[PDB]
């Protein structure tokens, strides 16, 4: 079904109100919940341009933007596919308390 | 759903709740 | 939508009819929606009459025939080709298939 579709990138760093987070489990209705690297478990919504275009699963470091009025929830934006996640761990912008390897 | 089995499910629920009523007294 | 004006039952003014078991799968069906065939056959097949004819006492024996109706559930009647899935304007023709040989 690729004929119906629209048919080596680089990482993007967090910028003043967004954070890298690790998904802990995938929730229904299209939602998800992720630990932000602050000691907090936030509730992320899979944003548009993202829903059924690029997938994500458990144990995947992924960028999420916060909403300034209600910190308890947030919306996920940009995914990182398992190789620039190591780079993210390397550059040290986020604490390395969470290593994810298989 | 078949309406038949939904009716059966609610019916069994009623039976359990009325047994709860009876045991409570 | 009412598929058949005769309701596909042929009861029409009887309330309820005794049920009869199918001959193949033994499904009970009303004795009117109970597609039914007169299985009249010679006790011996015509392919083997001659062997009987010239090797038997009682010259010019009757060679009787075996008689029985067959009652099918309509599922069997359709799968076992007893009844075909006819077309619309051809449904309202009830005459048997033109007396197979005449």
């Amino acid at each position: 079904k690729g004929r119906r579709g629209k048919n080596k990138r680089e990482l993007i760093y967090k910028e003043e109100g967004q954070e890298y987070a690790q998904i802990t489990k995938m929730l229904g209705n299209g939602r998800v919940e992720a630990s932000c690297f602050d000691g907090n478990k936030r509730m992320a919504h899979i944003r548009g341009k993202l829903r059924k275009k690029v997938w994500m699963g458990q144990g995947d470091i992924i960028l999420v933007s916060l909403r300034d009025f209600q910190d308890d929830q947030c919306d996920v934006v940009h995914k990182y596919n398992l190789d620039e996640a190591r780079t993210l761990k390397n550059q040290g912008e986020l604490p390395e308390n969470a290593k994810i390897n298989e | 759903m078949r309406a038949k089995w939904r009716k059966k499910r609610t019916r069994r629920l009623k039976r359990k709740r009325r047994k709860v009523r009876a045991r409570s007294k | 939508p009412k598929k058949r004006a005769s309701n596909g039952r042929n009861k029409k003014g009887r309330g309820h009819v005794k049920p009869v078991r199918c001959v193949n799968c033994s499904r009970s069906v009303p004795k009117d929606k109970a597609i039914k065939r007169m299985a009249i056959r010679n006790i011996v097949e015509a392919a083997a009459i001659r062997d009987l004819s010239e090797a038997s006492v009682y010259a010019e024996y009757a060679l009787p025939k075996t008689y029985n109706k067959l009652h099918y559930c309509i599922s069997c009647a359709i799968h076992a080709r007893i009844v075909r899935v006819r077309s619309r304007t051809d449904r309202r023709i009830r005459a048997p298939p033109q007396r197979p040989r005449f």
Partner: protein, 144 residues
């Protein structure tokens, strides 16, 4: 034919029978039962003053994706809690939570308009002044 009575002296049933079937129209049932007075936090009011608690973002339905900037509020007139919508672009950050806000209807007779689930009401006036006045830069929030 037309299986309702037609004799001169049948008037009674023609009234009472109608007096039964009127209970089918939801408008009539609401009007006689006064369900607008027990439920529907607006006790028949077209507007009510409440206190805002927190500013929320609410998702949208399937064909439309966007974060609608809604807002919780507890109504003074009864104490109930409802959710309302901020009906312009740059106006959520006009609310200044723990603020007196005047709520109105929302364009569908006590229902949910469009793609904002679980809401029933607009927002018209914030801190006395009307919100559209702020969004047009005609008047300014008192900030008191």
């Amino acid at each position: 034919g037309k299986g309702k009575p037609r004799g001169l002296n049948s008037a009674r049933k023609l009234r009472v029978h109608r007096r039964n079937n009127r209970w089918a129209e939801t408008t009539y049932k609401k009007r006689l039962l006064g369900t607008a007075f027990k439920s529907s936090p607006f006790g028949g009011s077209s507007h009510a003053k409440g206190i805002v608690l927190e500013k929320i973002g609410i998702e949208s339905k399937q064909p439309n994706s966007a974060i609608r900037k809604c807002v919780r509020v507890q109504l003074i007139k009864n104490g109930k809690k409802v959710t309302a919508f901020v009906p312009n672009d740059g106006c959520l950050n006009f609310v200044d939570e723990n603020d007196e806000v005047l709520l109105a209807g929302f364009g569908r007779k006590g229902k949910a308009k469009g793609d904002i689930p679980g809401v029933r009401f607009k927002v018209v006036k914030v801190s006395g002044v009307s919100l559209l006045a702020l969004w047009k830069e005609k008047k300014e929030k008192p900030r008191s």
